[PDB]
Structures are given as structure tokens and as C-alpha cells.
Design a protein around this ligand. Structure first.
Ligand SMILES: CCCCCCCCCCCCCCCCCC(=O)OC[C@H](CO[C@@H]1O[C@H](CO[C@H]2O[C@H](CO)[C@H](O)[C@H](O)[C@H]2O)[C@H](O)[C@H](O)[C@H]1O)OC(=O)CCCCCCCCCCCCCCCCC
Ligand code: CLA
Ligand code: CLA
Ligand code: CLA
Ligand code: CLA
Ligand code: CLA
Ligand code: CLA
Ligand SMILES: CCCCCCCCCCCCCCCC(=O)OC[C@H](CO[C@@H]1O[C@H](CS(=O)(=O)O)[C@@H](O)[C@H](O)[C@H]1O)OC(=O)CCCCCCCCCCCCCCC
Ligand SMILES: CC1=C(C#C/C(C)=C/C=C/C(C)=C/C=C/C=C(C)/C=C/C=C(\C)C#CC2=C(C)C[C@@H](O)CC2(C)C)C(C)(C)C[C@H](O)C1
Ligand SMILES: CC1=C(C#C/C(C)=C/C=C/C(C)=C/C=C/C=C(C)/C=C/C=C(C)/C=C/C2=C(C)CCCC2(C)C)C(C)(C)C[C@H](O)C1
Ligand SMILES: CCCCCCCCCCCCO[C@H]1O[C@H](CO)[C@@H](O[C@H]2O[C@H](CO)[C@@H](O)[C@H](O)[C@H]2O)[C@H](O)[C@H]1O
Lengths: 180, 160, 180, 35, 42, 168
């Protein structure tokens, strides 16, 4: 009757514990008004993008592609210094990827029209690592927890970079507490 | 250049900038330094100077009056003046109209459409608001599938 | 359990001030009816027991190492590279500088990842492994009385934990691990 | 001519008691500070 | 929250006021951080 | 039916003595027009803030963190307002209070007991008898601390002296 994550609040009714990472954490009750399938698809997309974002912010500080355009340890500066045409190309490619991966069903009214469509399952398993039922549940839980951790880490990284004005590794190695 | 002069190199534009800055400085001369009025007037001067400099570099054309003029004929050198801004409008407006029409149909197929139109079903309304981002292809799909245009024999009309 | 009911098990309270919690069922070695905060209700007993054994073993090794360092016994050639300082903190910093502590960290972490983590995961998934069991008895000292050895290990490790903490803080205050 | 560029982040820094003033160094200094 | 109160908040004038206040804030903040934009920058 | 606390005042109808620390004291009849559960949640939030404030005053007088300037508890308010730490404490209290709003709505719906946030990390209230005794103790200490924190702050404002300094 009570949520596992927040004991004093009641268990979210729409969260039945089937989904990975479900600890009954929905204090504001979004699941009541928004389909949990849509919410989980959004959660997985956010977590995946933030996994890649954290990896990129950490890696492109140490290894870069050749060229002055790509030579920027600071990630917010890389955003501007990288070739603008290339960035627009990435945007267009992301759009085409969304379209094809979602199979033209990219809206809240048609995304899950097919009963086969499952939240977050875009048909992406190039090496077929998810075909093992024994490890599939563990992999799902790991993916959700990784997405959550990476979301928090990416937010922290972006804002600490706004504050310090230095890369993440550089900040941690040469830390200077905020003064005004 | 079309029929006017670039605004970055116009004595009229420079004179207007000078007049604005001088008005602000005259207003500032009567306030102590560091007081909120002095800081506000200084920020106003900075904003005026930044606006004039940005207008100069934007490539805007200026007439004898010293004010930027817009060339809304289709010229690609002045697209940012009407066409790209207007494309952003058309995008947003088609979004609004498409989602509103979708909600009208959703309420039409309900127990109490009038209740749904005065007291809204905001989960479904937000659903449609989300859908509205590909309204061009969606609207054309509706048109070609025949769900958009109604037949002449199915729309009420007055007698001749 | 060795000396069940007298040394350990149900109905054993090393500190009668606090009541033996019902969660402590006397099934785990080292169960002397001490858990005033009732962590045993919610914690994973096997995981926490393995944690206790690991803490105790590291603390015992640390006590031996600190005592040798303060006594001044050094391996041949250690003094030339690191130094002749007896202070534990100076020794730690010097070894970190040279690279000794880094290699120890690397290999301890490798052992953790390849042995302790898999073993702990299987034990928590119900392998039946005794907490703190790695099969490391080359000299066969535990064949005679494994349960007696287990209780002795747990208690010696607890005492070593407390002693090592005390020694570090004594070194902080007086500059001596003894603190006399 | 066009090669991936590897830049070492550590340089000569150390997690503690190093020339570089790290986050751990900041926390230690703060705990040992004097008003 | 009471479902009746939520329906009241879903009533047309409340939603119109909230949505248009949100839009006004959007435009005001856009003009506060990017002022005097008489043109799309190209 | 007169109140146990005040013999000459009639027992408030809503106050039936079920709640801890209920001695029939409500001369102005807030319980008559307002929900007693909401009022009790307010009471316990106030009292918890006040008890923690008293302990904070004392611990700040005796000890201050090495990285913070040493100052009297009241002055630390204005100091941290400008420093930015007060902003952080306010933001995080607000973050917890956002979920407090949901807890309050559930309390109105009857799914929770006022002041009962299921916060027993050390498992000190497992047995009923001790739980009821602890609840009476909590309400008593809450009220006493609510009085005492006002006493502390006002005495500092008058004497410009910390309470420990003043007591001698
Ligand atoms: C969560 C659960 C796990 C928790 C376990 C940890 C329990 C706590 C135990 C304390 C361990 C402290 C970790 C701090 C390590 C550090 O700050 O790490 C920093 C050091 C960096 O190396 C040090 O770098 C130093 C840098 O020197 C500089 O810094 C020094 C002090 O920083 C001096 O100032 C010196 O003069 C100055 O030049 C030295 O030069 C040496 O290179 C070396 O001592 O990490 C190393 O040594 C690199 C070793 C590789 C790391 C391997 C870890 C992973 C192992 C998994 C197995 C797979 C491995 C494959
Ligand atoms: C449809 C085919 C296509 C074509 C013809 C191009 C053409 C170009 N792209 Mg690419 N690009 C494409 C698809 C394509 N792209 C797609 C699908 C994406 C998204 C995944 C990108 C993302 C992208 C970025 C982010 C960038 C380019 C850039 C370039 C330019 C590279 C110039 C050069 O000599 O690089 C030679 C270099 C290589 C062959 C090295 C390849 C490196 C990768 C990581 C492997 C060139 C105009 C760059 C640019 O605009 O520079 C001015 C740039 O920054 N592109
Ligand atoms: C009232 C009549 C009128 C009309 C209807 C137009 C219409 C147009 N003029 Mg304009 N023009 C006019 C009078 C008019 N003009 C006059 C009188 C002058 C002289 C003062 C000009 C001078 C002028 C210039 C100098 C230019 C135009 C251009 C254009 C076109 C801009 C968009 C385009 O090229 O889309 C093309 C894009 C597509 C077909 C699809 C794009 C697809 C994706 C979304 C991108 C558009 C068709 C531009 C052009 O190139 O026209 C051919 C242009 O350079 N006009
Ligand atoms: C900040 C600037 C600004 C502001 C405040 C407005 C404000 C307005 N515009 Mg807009 N407009 C602007 C810039 C601006 N415009 C620019 C730059 C352009 C040039 C592209 C236009 C072009 C434009 C058009 C073409 C129309 C408006 C209309 C309107 C009014 C109603 C819009 C509406 O109900 O949308 C909510 C959306 C709907 C109700 C859905 C139906 C209507 C939209 C506009 C259809 C969009 C898609 C459609 C396929 C476009 C076909 C256009 C073609 C026939 C020419 C509103 C007062 C409308 C008007 O006055 O109608 C009497 C209108 O039809 N505007
Ligand atoms: C981190 C600690 C440490 C350090 C800095 C050293 C350093 C050294 N040891 Mg070693 N040594 C160590 C731990 C250490 N030892 C331990 C734990 C033991 C086991 C008791 C030994 C036992 C040992 C022996 C028996 C000998 C060395 C020797 C040496 C020297 C040469 C070894 C070589 O070339 O490699 C070198 C200065 C050799 C030496 O002195 O060469 C003349 C040598 O004979 N060491
Ligand atoms: C004095 C403390 C002490 C005691 C009583 C024990 C007792 C035990 N250990 Mg050992 N162990 C110790 C310290 C101790 N350990 C330390 C410091 C470490 C870390 C290096 C380990 C690491 C270790 C492992 C990895 C394993 C054991 C295991 C065992 C059990 C098998 C028999 C054995 O090893 O007898 C030891 C007899 C002794 C006399 C050891 C003391 C030697 C001094 C120097 C004299 C037994 C319960 C095995 C087991 O199944 O544990 C549950 C096992 O796999 N121990
Ligand atoms: C995990 C979440 C989180 C995060 C990311 C931050 C972030 C921040 N907090 Mg903190 N804060 C948090 C939780 C968090 N806080 C919580 C839960 C509370 C209590 C409700 C506070 C209360 C608080 C206060 C009162 C203050 C901050 C300050 C700060 C800033 C530190 C600037 C700096 O360089 O510090 C670098 C940090 C370190 C080097 C670590 C030092 C840690 C010390 C030694 C131990 C602390 C002991 C004790 C709790 C005090 C920064 C914006 C300060 C600020 O605004 O500065 C301008 C400040 O005064 N925070
Ligand atoms: C700067 C960034 C811009 C560049 C990024 C480009 C990506 C654009 C993606 C558009 C998209 O996903 O459309 C999704 C829509 C779904 O529409 C929906 O299609 C539905 C049926 S179905 O989806 O086709 O099965 C239909 O019922 C519904 O009304 C309709 O809206 O797909 C289509 O209907 C046709 C797509 C057009 C294919 C040609 C494009 C070639 C390029
Ligand atoms: C799925 C799949 C595949 C795949 C795949 C792939 C590519 C998987 C990639 C996974 C990745 C990149 C995961 C990254 C996770 C990052 C995390 C959790 C970061 C957390 C950061 C934190 C907490 C932080 C922080 C911090 C902050 C903010 C403050 C700082 O001062 C400190 C710190 C830095 C610590 C393949 C291709 C193999 C095919 C297969 O058939 C299917
Ligand atoms: C302003 C400000 C701040 C502040 C602040 C704060 C936190 C101010 C807090 C003020 C407080 C907590 C005042 C409390 C007053 C309590 C009274 C008068 C109780 C009377 C009880 C009685 C009479 C009980 C009677 C009892 C009753 C009824 C029944 C039993 C018998 C009897 C004994 C008779 C700072 C510090 C942040 C500084 C900043 O610059 C801004
Ligand atoms: C391969 C054949 C595919 C045919 C389909 C192509 C359709 C659309 C192509 C659009 C033109 C390509 O877009 C391009 O414009 C940008 C303008 O800043 C270029 O930007 C840059 O490009 C060059 C380097 O690659 C530099 O020499 C230019 O100085 C620089 O402007 C990018 O090269 C690319 O982003």
C-alpha cells in the first residue's frame, strides 16, 4: 500500500513493479496521467543520450579528432568550435534516425500503435546480446540504472562547467571554490 | 544597396545613435554615481550601443531617415528579414492549428463533447500538443487519405 | 556454531545493556546478540557478513603493517627508495609518490573484481558459499576445526579493526600509533 | 598529418599532496583551516 | 489532489490564463536575453 | 465536558484525547474550523524545526566548522544570506517540502498520520509501548523547544550575548 522508495507516500497505482528499476518512486504521480510506456521510452532515451554525453565529455577532453576545429578540451567551447556544418549534419542524421528507428510512429498518438512495440525497444541489438532470457532482466535493470546515473552526472557536469569554466577532469585536478 | 545604403555606414544612423546616447547621458548627469538610477541609465546606454552596433553588422539597409528598412521581396540576401521569420511563424501556427483540430475531433468522439471543450482533458490535450511537431507531413497525410477535406454533399449549406 | 549458546548463537548477549534483536537468529558466525539499531531487519545478512570479514582481514593486515613500520623493520632496499621515516602517513605518501601503493591498489582491485565481486554476487544469489570463503587454506590449518577458526577469525578481525582505528588517531594526536 | 590527438589530462597532478590543488586537497585544507 | 479541484483547474479560462501567462513569460524572457531582434541573424 | 488542561474551559469537541499531548487545550477553537490532522502536522513540523534550531544554536556556540567564520548563531543568518549557503539550505528544505506537499495531500485523504513520515532509521520505535511514550515525549519536547528557540533569539537580540555566555 506504501511506496518502497518513499515509505510515507502511497504506492503509485500505475507502477505495478513489472518495469525494471521500479521502486514505487512517483511522488508527483505523473504515471496517473501519462502512459508509463511513453514515460519509460522517454526515460530510456534520456538515459542513453546522457550515457553517451557523459562518455563524450570525459573522453573528448583527452582524445580529439585531428584539427584545430576539434581541438578543444572544454566541452562547451567544443560545441561552438566544432564545424557548424558538421553539427547541422549530426542534427539531420539524428532526425532521420528517430524517424526510421521509430518506423514513422514518432508521436504520442501513434508511437505504440503496434502491440509488438514495447517501451524503449527500437530493434537495436546489433550483436544480439539481449537474446538470453537469463541475463535479459539484469541487462534491463543495468540499462535503466545507468541511464539515471548518467542523467544526473551529465547535468552536474554541464553546470559545474558553467561555474568553473574548466573541463571536468581539469576542475577536479585544479579545483578552485566558487567566489562570486 | 537595393535602393538604399548599408546601415553600418550611414551618417543618419550614426546621428540617431548619437542622439539616443546623448539623451541618456543628459538624464544620467543628474544622478549620483553608483546609485540605482545611474546604474540603470548606464545599462540603457550600453543596450542602445549594442543594439545599434548589431544592427550595423547585421547587414540591414537604412534610408535617409536613418532607420533600418526591410526588403521583403524574396531576395536571399535579406531572407532573415521576412522569410525565415515567417517560416518559423508558419511552423508554430500550423502546430497550434493541427493540435487544436485533433483535440476537436477527440472531443467529438466522446460522451460529452461540450464538457470536454469547456473542461478540458489536459492529458489528451498535452498528447496532441506533443504530436504537433510533424504537423506538415501529418496534415498532408490526412489530406491524401481524405480525412481532411469533407465532401460537398456532407456539409450544410443555406438555400440559394 | 562453536560453543553454540555460550559463545555464539541464539540467547547470547555480549552486552546485556541492549536486548538481543529477534533478527539475530544465531545462524551467523560472530552472532553475539549485538545489533541495537536493528540493521539486520533490512540489510542483506550474507552481504554484511562478507563485508565484516573483509574489513577484519584488511584491519589485521594493516595492524601488522603499521606495527612493523613503527618498529622500523623494512625490507631490503625499501629504505633507499622510500625513505627511513617511521611515520605511517609519511610512508603512505612516499609509497604513493614512488608507485608502490598504486600497484597494490591495482592488484587488490583486480583481485576484488575477479574473485570477491563474482563470489559475493553468487553468494547473494544463493550459491551457498560461506561468507568470507575463498578456499584459501594452502597450509590446511582450518581442516581440524573450521568453525572454531571462523569465530576466532571474526573476533580477531573486529579487535584489529578497533586497534587500527585507534592507532591511526593516536598517531594523529601524539605522533605515535601507541598513543601511550 | 591528420592523426587522433591524445592529450594527457593528469599532467603532473596527484589526487592529494601534489603540486596541483585538487578537490581532495581543497577538502583537506578546508578541514585543517584556521579562521 | 481533489479530482474536482483538478477539473476546475482544467476549466477553459484557468487553462487559457495559465497557458497565455506561460507564453508571455516565454516571449518576455526571450526578449530579456536576446533583445532588439528585428531580424533572424544570417 | 471540560478540558483536562483548563478546568473551566469546555473540552474542544474535535480534541478527544486520541492524539499525543492532547490535554484539551484549544481556547480559540482552531480545531473547530480547521482539520486537526493538518494542524497536528503543522505543530510537529514547527516543533521539529524548533528543536533542531535549539540544538543548532548550542552546537554553533560551542563549535563552528573550521572553514566557516566564527560568529553568533543569529548573525550567521545574515552572513550566509550573502554568502550563498543559506540559499542552498533554503533550496533543499524546499525540495523536501515539495514531497511534503504530497504527504499533506495524502494526510487530507486519510492515508497518513500527521507527522508520521515513517522515519525510523535506527529502529527505535519498534514496540508500541515505547512508541506511544516516545510520541508523547516528542510532542512535549516539540512544544518546549518552540518556546525555547524564541526565548534564545529574543534574549540574544536584547543582550547581544549568546545563551551559554549569558547563563553566567
Ligand atoms: C567503490 C568500491 C571500491 C572502493 C575501493 C577503494 C577503497 C579505498 C582504499 C583507498 C584507495 C584510494 C584510491 C585513490 C587512488 C588515487 O587517487 O589514484 C591515483 C593513482 C595515480 O598513481 C599515482 O600517481 C602518483 C602521481 O604523483 C603525483 O602525486 C603524488 C600524490 O598524488 C605525489 O604528489 C607525487 O609527487 C606527484 O608526482 C605517482 O606518481 C604514482 O604514479 C602513483 O602513486 O592511481 C594509481 O596509482 C593508478 C592505479 C590504477 C587504478 C586501478 C584501480 C582499478 C583496479 C581494478 C583492477 C583493474 C585494473 C586494470
Ligand atoms: C551523405 C554523405 C555525407 C557526405 C558527402 C559528407 C561530407 C562531409 N562531412 Mg559528413 N556527415 C554525414 C554524411 C556525409 N558527410 C553524416 C550522416 C553525418 C552524421 C553522422 C555527418 C557528420 C559530419 C560532421 C560532424 C562533420 C562532417 C563533415 C563533413 C565534411 C568532411 C570533409 C573531409 O574532407 O572530411 C575528411 C575526414 C574524414 C573522412 C574522417 C572521418 C571521421 C569519422 C569520425 C570516421 C564533408 C562536407 C565535417 C565538416 O563539416 O567539416 C568542415 C564535420 O565536422 N560530417
Ligand atoms: C509580387 C510579386 C513577387 C512574388 C510573388 C515574388 C516571389 C519570389 N521572389 Mg521576388 N521579387 C519581386 C516580386 C515578387 N517576388 C520583385 C518586383 C522584385 C524586384 C524588386 C523581386 C526580386 C527578387 C529577387 C532578387 C529574388 C526574388 C526571389 C523570390 C522567390 C523567393 C523564394 C524562393 O526562391 O524559393 C525557392 C525555394 C523553393 C522553390 C523551395 C525550397 C524548399 C525548402 C523548404 C528549402 C519568390 C518565388 C528570390 C529567388 O530566387 O526567386 C526565384 C530572389 O533571389 N525576388
Ligand atoms: C510576431 C509576429 C506575428 C504575430 C504576433 C502574428 C499574429 C497572427 N498571425 Mg501571423 N504571421 C507572421 C508574424 C506574426 N503573426 C509572419 C512573419 C507571417 C508571414 C509568414 C505571418 C503569416 C500569417 C498568416 C498566413 C496568417 C497569420 C495569422 C495570424 C493571426 C492568427 C494566427 C493564429 O490563429 O494562429 C493559430 C493557428 C491556426 C488558427 C491554424 C490556421 C491558421 C494558420 C496560420 C495556418 C498555418 C499553416 C498553413 C498551411 C499556411 C498556409 C498559408 C497560405 C495560405 C498563405 C495572428 C494575429 C492568420 C490570420 O490572420 O488569419 C486571419 C493567418 O492566416 N499570420
Ligand atoms: C616497496 C618496497 C620495496 C622497495 C622499494 C624495494 C627495493 C629494492 N629491493 Mg626489495 N623487497 C621488498 C620490498 C621492496 N624492495 C620486500 C617486501 C621484500 C621481501 C622481504 C624484498 C626483499 C628484497 C631482497 C631480498 C632484495 C631486495 C633488493 C631490493 C633492491 C633491488 C631490487 C630490484 O632491482 O628490483 C631495491 C632497492 C635487493 C638488493 O638489496 O640488492 C642488492 C635484494 O637483495 N628486496
Ligand atoms: C589470525 C586471524 C585469522 C584466523 C583465525 C583465520 C581463520 C581462517 N581463515 Mg584466514 N585470513 C586472515 C587471518 C585469519 N584467518 C587474514 C589476515 C587474511 C587476509 C590475508 C585471511 C584470508 C583468508 C582467506 C582468503 C580465507 C581464509 C580462510 C580462513 C579459514 C580457513 C583456515 C585458515 O585459514 O586458518 C588460518 C589459521 C591461522 C593460524 C592464520 C593466522 C596466521 C598467523 C600469522 C600466525 C579460517 C576461518 C578461508 C575460509 O574459508 O574462510 C572463511 C579462506 O578462503 N582466510
Ligand atoms: C549533492 C548535492 C549538492 C551539490 C551539488 C551542492 C553544491 C553546492 N553547495 Mg551544497 N548543500 C547540499 C547539497 C549539495 N550542494 C545539501 C544537501 C545542503 C544542506 C541542505 C547543502 C548546503 C550548502 C551550504 C550551506 C553551502 C553549500 C554550498 C555549495 C556550493 C559549493 C561550492 C564549492 O566550490 O564547494 C566545493 C566543495 C568542497 C571543496 C567540499 C567541501 C566539503 C566540506 C569540507 C565538508 C562539509 C561538512 C558540513 C556538512 C558543513 C555548491 C553550489 C556553499 C555555497 O553556496 O558556496 C558559495 C554553501 O555555503 N551547500
Ligand atoms: C533540422 C532537422 C530536420 C531534418 C530531420 C529529418 C527527419 C524528419 C522526420 C520526419 C518524420 O519522421 O515523419 C514521420 C511520418 C509519420 O507520419 C504519420 O504517418 C502515419 C501513418 S504511418 O506512420 O506512415 O504508418 C499517419 O497516420 C499520420 O497521420 C502521419 O502523421 O512519416 C510519414 O508519414 C512519411 C515520411 C516521409 C518520407 C520521406 C522523407 C524523406 C526524407
Ligand atoms: C546497447 C548495445 C551496445 C551498446 C552500447 C553502448 C555504447 C553502451 C555505452 C554505455 C555508456 C557510455 C555508459 C555510460 C555511463 C555513464 C555514467 C553512468 C556516468 C555517470 C557519472 C556520474 C555519476 C558522475 C559524475 C560526476 C559529476 C557530475 C561531478 C564530477 O565532479 C565527478 C563525476 C565525474 C564523478 C552495443 C553497441 C555494444 C551493441 C549491443 O548489441 C547493444
Ligand atoms: C527575525 C529574524 C530571525 C528570526 C527568527 C525567529 C526564528 C524568530 C522566532 C521567534 C519565536 C519562535 C518566538 C516565540 C515566542 C513564543 C512565545 C511568546 C510563547 C509563549 C508561550 C506561553 C505564554 C505559554 C504558556 C503556557 C501555556 C499556554 C500552557 C501551559 C502553561 C503556560 C506556561 C502558562 C532571524 C533569527 C533569522 C534573524 C533575521 O534577521 C530575521
Ligand atoms: C556527396 C554528394 C551528396 C549530395 C547531396 C548534398 C546535398 C546538400 C549539400 C549541402 C552543402 C554541404 O554543406 C556544407 O556547407 C558548409 C558551409 O559552412 C560547409 O562548411 C565548410 O565546408 C568546407 C570544408 O568541408 C570548407 O572548405 C568551407 O570553407 C566551410 O564553409 C561544409 O562543407 C558543409 O556543411
Amino acid at each position: 500500500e506504501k511506496s518502497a522508495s518513499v515509505p510515507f507516500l502511497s504506492k503509485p497505482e500505475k507502477l505495478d513493479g513489472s518495469m525494471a528499476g521500479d521502486v514505487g518512486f512517483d511522488p508527483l504521480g505523473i504515471s496517473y496521467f501519462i502512459d508509463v510506456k511513453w514515460l519509460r521510452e522517454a526515460e530510456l532515451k534520456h538515459g542513453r543520450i546522457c550515457m553517451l554525453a557523459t562518455a563524450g565529455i570525459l573522453v573528448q577532453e583527452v582524445i580529439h579528432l585531428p584539427g584545430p576545429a576539434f581541438s578543444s578540451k572544454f566541452a562547451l567551447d567544443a560545441w561552438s568550435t566544432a564545424p557548424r556544418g558538421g553539427m547541422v549534419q549530426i542534427l539531420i542524421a539524428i532526425g532521420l534516425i528517430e524517424m526510421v528507428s521509430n518506423r514513422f510512429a514518432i508521436t504520442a498518438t501513434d508511437m505504440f500503435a503496434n502491440p509488438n512495440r514495447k517501451p524503449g525497444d527500437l530493434g537495436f541489438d546489433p550483436l544480439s546480446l539481449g537474446a538470453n532470457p537469463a541475463t535479459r532482466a539484469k541487462y534491463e535493470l543495468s540499462e535503466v540504472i545507468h541511464g539515471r546515473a548518467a542523467m544526473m552526472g551529465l547535468s552536474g557536469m554541464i553546470h559545474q562547467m558553467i561555474v568553473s569554466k574548466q573541463p571536468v577532469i581539469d576542475q577536479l585536478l585544479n579545483f578552485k571554490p566558487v567566489d562570486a | 544597396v537595393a535602393g538604399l545604403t548599408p546601415c553600418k555606414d550611414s551618417k543618419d544612423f550614426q546621428r540617431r545613435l548619437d542622439g539616443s546616447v546623448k539623451k541618456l547621458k543628459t538624464r544620467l548627469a543628474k544622478y549620483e554615481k553608483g546609485t540605482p538610477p545611474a546604474l540603470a541609465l548606464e545599462k540603457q546606454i550600453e543596450r542602445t550601443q549594442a543594439r545599434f552596433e548589431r544592427y550595423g553588422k547585421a547587414g540591414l539597409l537604412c534610408g535617409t531617415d536613418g532607420l533600418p528598412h526591410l526588403i521583403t521581396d524574396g531576395r536571399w540576401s535579406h531572407s532573415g528579414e521576412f522569410v525565415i521569420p515567417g517560416l518559423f511563424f508558419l511552423y508554430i501556427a500550423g502546430w497550434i492549428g493541427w493540435v487544436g483540430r485533433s483535440y476537436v475531433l477527440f472531443a467529438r468522439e466522446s460522451d460529452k463533447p461540450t464538457e470536454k471543450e469547456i473542461i478540458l482533458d489536459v492529458p489528451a490535450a498535452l498528447s496532441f500538443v506533443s504530436t504537433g511537431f510533424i504537423w506538415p507531413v501529418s496534415a498532408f497525410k490526412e489530406f491524401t487519405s481524405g480525412n481532411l477535406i469533407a465532401d460537398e454533399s456532407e456539409i450544410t449549406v443555406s438555400p440559394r | 556454531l562453536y560453543k553454540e549458546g555460550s559463545l555464539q548463537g541464539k540467547g547470547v548477549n555480549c552486552i546485556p545493556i541492549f536486548k538481543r534483536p529477534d533478527s539475530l537468529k544465531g545462524d551467523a558466525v560472530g552472532d553475539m546478540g549485538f545489533d541495537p539499531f536493528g540493521f539486520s531487519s533490512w540489510v542483506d545478512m550474507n552481504y554484511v557478513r562478507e563485508a565484516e570479514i573483509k574489513h577484519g582481514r584488511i584491519a589485521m593486515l594493516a595492524f601488522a603493517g603499521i606495527v612493523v613500520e613503527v618498529l622500523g623493520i623494512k625490507a631490503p632496499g625499501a629504505g633507499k627508495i622510500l625513505g627511513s621515516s617511521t611515520d605511517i602517513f609519511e610512508i603512505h605518501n612516499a609509497a604513493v609518490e614512488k608507485g608502490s601503493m598504486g600497484q597494490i591498489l591495482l592488484w587488490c582491485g583486480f583481485f576484488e573484481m575477479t574473485a570477491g565481486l563474482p563470489a559475493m554476487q553468487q553468494m547473494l544469489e544463493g550459491s551457498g558459499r560461506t561468507p568470507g570463503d575463498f578456499g584459501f587454506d594452502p597450509l590446511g590449518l582450518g581442516k581440524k576445526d573450521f568453525a572454531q577458526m571462523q569465530i576466532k577469525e571474526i573476533q580477531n578481525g573486529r579487535l584489529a579493526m578497533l586497534a587500527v582505528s585507534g592507532m591511526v588517531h593516536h598517531a594523529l594526536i601524539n605522533g605515535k600509533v601507541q598513543g601511550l | 598529418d591528420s592523426m587522433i590527438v591524445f592529450e594527457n589530462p593528469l599532467g603532473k597532478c596527484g589526487a592529494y599532496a601534489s603540486s596541483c590543488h585538487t578537490f581532495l586537497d581543497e577538502m583537506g585544507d578546508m578541514l585543517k583551516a584556521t579562521p | 489532489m481533489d479530482s474536482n479541484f483538478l477539473k476546475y483547474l482544467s476549466t477553459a479560462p484557468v487553462l487559457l490564463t495559465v497557458w497565455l501567462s506561460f507564453t508571455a513569460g516565454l516571449v518576455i524572457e526571450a526578449n530579456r536575453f536576446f533583445p532588439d531582434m528585428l531580424y533572424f541573424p544570417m | 465536558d471540560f478540558s483536562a488542561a483548563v478546568p473551566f474551559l469546555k473540552r474542544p469537541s474535535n480534541l478527544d484525547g486520541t492524539l499525543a499531548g492532547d490535554v484539551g487545550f484549544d481556547p480559540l477553537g482552531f480545531s473547530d474550523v480547521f482539520d486537526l490532522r493538518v494542524l497536528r502536522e503543522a505543530e510537529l513540523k514547527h516543533g521539529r524545526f524548533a528543536m533542531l534550531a535549539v540544538l543548532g544554536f548550542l552546537v554553533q556556540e560551542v563549535y563552528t566548522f573550521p572553514f566557516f567564520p566564527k560568529m553568533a548563531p543569529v548573525d550567521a543568518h545574515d552572513y550566509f544570506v550573502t554568502q550563498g549557503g543559506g540559499s542552498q539550505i533554503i533550496f533543499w528544505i524546499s525540495f523536501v517540502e515539495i514531497f511534503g506537499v504530497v504527504a499533506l495531500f495524502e494526510l487530507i485523504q486519510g492515508k497518513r498520520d500527521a507527522g508520521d513520515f515513517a522515519f525510523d532509521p535506527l529502529g527505535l520505535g519498534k514496540d508500541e509501548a515505547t512508541l506511544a511514550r516516545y510520541k508523547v515525549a516528542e510532542i512535549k519536547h516539540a512544544r518546549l523547544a518552540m518556546i525555547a528557540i524564541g526565548g534564545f533569539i529574543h534574549q540574544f537580540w536584547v543582550t547581544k550575548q549568546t545563551v551559554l555566555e549569558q547563563l553566567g
